[PDB]
């Protein structure tokens, strides 16, 4: 009758994007004017990305493919101090096309860059147009630093969902893990080759979290769902970046199917009470609405079947 769902995971793992998908799928969605509201966010995410790339060229010591880009780089920061002009667009277009910044871009594993960077930049002509209005996908691609607990309600298959986006508190934690029906833990598959910021690979940090989750006594009666997310970025990434960067003891081949399977085990093996509790793993793309719909529909079935079994119905 009532379901308390919890979204846990490392930063930029897909938690908040899943939330948007819930409103898109089990609520109204996104109106014309709601999308217009993210226009500023989109422009922001675009600018900070190209900048991050350009900044990285300073550390990594990478030259442009044309000294004429030095001027555009200059103007980028200058113009940033002022929403999308027609001049800034060209400044970014010219930079994004330069073989110089493109080389630094393909080395984004050595610094912090937005995952939606290429998405926006490769579609700049459209976004930069005056009176442009963000598509629903554009909205999903945005990155917003969500802080604090974020409650969200929706009804699906005759169930009232109370979904919490956990992304500083003290006793507020206690009043959060109280009788959680199910936990959806998000993992960014593509974060396996991200450099050592700290002394533990991003992926290893995620395993750390998941370990404490499914093994904790708090969730002995909680359905544990594992969302191996960003499979789309991972599929392309694995072709050029060895999984051994994350797990050096990995003897498998650098294919999507095999490498993904390996990562699934590394997480599922963190389950100590394997005899008592099962982990429901899904390979997802949080920005893919059709996929999230399918995956969440599957999750709901699991939750229903477990609501019955308990109070003796199944």
């Amino acid at each position: 009758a009532e379901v308390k769902l919890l979204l846990l995971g490392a930063r930029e793992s897909g938690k908040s994007t899943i939330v948007k998908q819930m409103k898109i799928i089990h609520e109204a969605g996104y109106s014309e004017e709601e999308c217009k509201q993210y226009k500023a966010v989109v422009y922001s995410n675009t600018i900070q990305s190209i900048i991050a790339i350009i900044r990285a060229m300073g550390r990594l010591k990478i030259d442009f493919g044309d000294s004429a880009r030095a001027d555009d780089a200059r103007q980028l920061f200058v113009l940033a101090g002022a929403f999308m002009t027609a001049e800034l667009a060209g400044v970014i277009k010219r930079l994004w096309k330069d073989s110089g910044v493109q080389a630094c871009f393909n080395r984004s594993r050595e610094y912090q860059l937005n995952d939606s960077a290429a998405y926006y930049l490769n579609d700049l002509d459209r976004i930069a147009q005056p009176n442009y209005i963000p598509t629903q996908q554009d909205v999903l691609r945005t990155r917003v630093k969500t802080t604090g607990i974020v409650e969200t309600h929706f009804t699906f298959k005759d169930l009232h969902f109370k979904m919490f986006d956990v992304g500083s508190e003290r006793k507020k934690w206690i009043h959060c893990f109280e009788g959680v029906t199910a936990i959806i833990f998000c993992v960014a598959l593509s974060d396996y080759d991200l450099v050592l910021a700290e002394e533990m690979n991003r992926m290893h940090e995620s395993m750390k979290l998941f370990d404490s989750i499914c093994n904790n006594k708090w969730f002995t009666d909680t359905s544990i769902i594992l969302f191996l997310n960003k499979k789309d970025l991972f599929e392309e990434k694995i072709k050029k970046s060895p999984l051994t960067i994350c797990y050096p003891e990995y003897a498998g081949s650098n294919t999507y199917e095999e490498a993904a399977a390996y990562i699934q085990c590394q997480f599922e093996d963190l389950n100590k009470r394997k005899d008592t509790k099962e982990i429901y793993t899904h390979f997802t793309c949080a920005t893919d609405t059709k996929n999230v719909q399918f995956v969440f529909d599957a999750v709901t079935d699991v939750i229903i079947k477990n609501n019955l079994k308990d109070c003796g119905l199944f």
């Binding site: 956990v166 500083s168 934690w173 404490s212």
Partner: peptide, 6 residues
């Protein structure tokens, strides 16, 4: 934070 909390 909520990690060490556990």
């Amino acid at each position: 934070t909520w990690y060490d909390f556990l």
